[PDB]
């Protein structure tokens, strides 16, 4: 078998393949995660270079791993499918062997472990993908939001963004998000998520996707018109 060590240390103590994988993430479309008091919202950018697209059948950016956990990403699309598939398999494997669904933290820990394994295994390159994993633990009403990256490190976030121009939207979130008082309702949480994407997106038409996840496996994706109403209200307040 092909055993070649592709991910290796350099004289200055860097693993370039892992760092170049982060550059692939930088290229990917922007993704954002914001957790309110009783919900988490996942926002995603859709680049409008591709029209004549069939939006019914085109792979959506936010993926359900289980009925209570979702995963969005930035980076190589093909790579993300492999992580999503493994995560979905592990989710059912956990339910089967332990008789409880996975915690969001556990699922994140697994996906992060897969990413890490691909940084010190022979013959393989790292995943050019960073993920945002969100949801609610079984019989728990505390929101959960985690991030992973090609190196395999993971951590929990009150709010976070990844992908292209993520530096700008993180700047926005850092000044707009208050920890002592997070978005109390779904409306406030979605509004703050749309606002953050409007710093980067371009047109607020079919370029913004929003997915709201509430406790007890209550997950819904907003439509174009619903999002368009947020886009309208934000700019009308801005004209002042």
């Amino acid at each position: 078998g092909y055993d070649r060590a592709l991910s290796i240390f350099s004289p200055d103590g860097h693993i370039f393949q892992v760092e170049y994988a982060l550059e692939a993430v930088k290229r990917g479309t922007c993704a954002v995660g914001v957790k309110g008091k009783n919900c988490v919202v996942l926002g995603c950018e859709r680049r409008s270079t591709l029209k004549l697209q069939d939006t019914r059948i085109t792979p959506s950016k936010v993926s359900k791993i289980d009925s209570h956990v979702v995963l969005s990403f930035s980076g190589l699309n093909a790579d993300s499918r492999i992580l999503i598939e493994k995560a979905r398999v592990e989710a059912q494997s956990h339910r089967l062997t332990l008789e409880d669904p996975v915690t969001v933290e556990y699922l994140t820990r697994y996906v992060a472990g897969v990413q890490q394994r691909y940084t010190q295994s022979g013959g393989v390159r790292p995943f050019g993908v960073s993920t945002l994993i969100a949801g609610f633990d079984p019989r728990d009403d505390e929101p959960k939001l985690y991030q992973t990256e090609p190196s395999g490190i993971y951590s929990s976030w009150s709010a976070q963004t990844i992908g292209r121009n993520s530096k700008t939207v993180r700047e926005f979130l850092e000044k707009n998000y208050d920890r002592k008082e997070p978005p109390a309702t779904v409306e406030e949480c979605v509004k703050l998520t749309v606002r953050s994407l409007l710093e980067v997106v371009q047109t607020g038409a079919k370029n913004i996707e929003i997915t709201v996840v509430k406790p007890d496996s209550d997950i819904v994706a907003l439509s174009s018109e619903e999002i368009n109403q947020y886009v309208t209200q934000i700019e009308q307040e801005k004209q002042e």
Binding site: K64, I65, D66, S67, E85, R88, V89, A91, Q92, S93, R95, L96
Partner: protein, 195 residues
């Protein structure tokens, strides 16, 4: 577990399954539920050798739940039954086969039709209006042959099912400790808590 019945009426499928579990000469449990929900509109009851039954059922359940998540779509009862059959037909020529007989009751939301599939441990599949495994059919099929119509209501199906259970309780040597009855229709799966 020995006893599992099934009947497909106008607008639903009804599965009745015994409650007894016996180890040696002692009845350990008289409230056992010999069924697994594979999807919101598909229920599978099972009977066979100890252990293999639950292990197989849960294994199938996991696979169908995985498919549902991957495609964001519920497989038709027919598609699920074919998957289950293949797993058993695969199993029979294994080193140690899984000794499990199943009934799959589902409501096809596309065709708006209830469907009942009977599959034994060899992988022998048949679609039926009513079915059973083991010796259950020997006692009950004569009643079902006589009373069954395809335009029966769910309430009529339950009454015919009560008559079947009464006959079993009269002529079977084994005490199976009654049955747990479940109904599968357009609204999903629910349990009849008084039977």
């Amino acid at each position: 577990m020995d006893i599992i019945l099934g009947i497909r009426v106008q607008d639903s499928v009804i599965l009745a399954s015994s409650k007894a579990v016996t180890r040696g000469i002692s009845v350990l449990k008289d409230s056992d539920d010999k069924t697994r929900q594979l999807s919101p509109h598909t229920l599978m009851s099972f009977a066979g050798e100890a252990g293999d039954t639950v292990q197989f059922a849960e294994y199938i359940q996991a696979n169908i739940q995985l498919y549902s998540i991957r495609e964001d779509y519920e497989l038709s009862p027919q598609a699920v039954s074919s998957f289950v059959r293949q797993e058993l037909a695969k199993s029979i020529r294994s080193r140690r086969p899984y000794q499990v007989n199943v009934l799959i009751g589902g409501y096809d939301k596309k065709k708006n039709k209830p469907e009942l599939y009977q599959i034994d441990y060899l992988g022998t599949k048949v679609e039926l209006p009513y079915g059973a495994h083991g010796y259950s059919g020997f006692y009950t099929f004569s009643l079902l042959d006589h009373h069954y119509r395809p335009d029966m209501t769910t309430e009529e199906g339950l009454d015919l099912l009560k008559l079947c259970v009464q006959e079993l309780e009269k002529r079977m040597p084994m005490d199976f400790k009654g049955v747990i009855v479940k109904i599968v229709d357009k609204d999903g799966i629910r349990q009849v808590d008084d039977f």
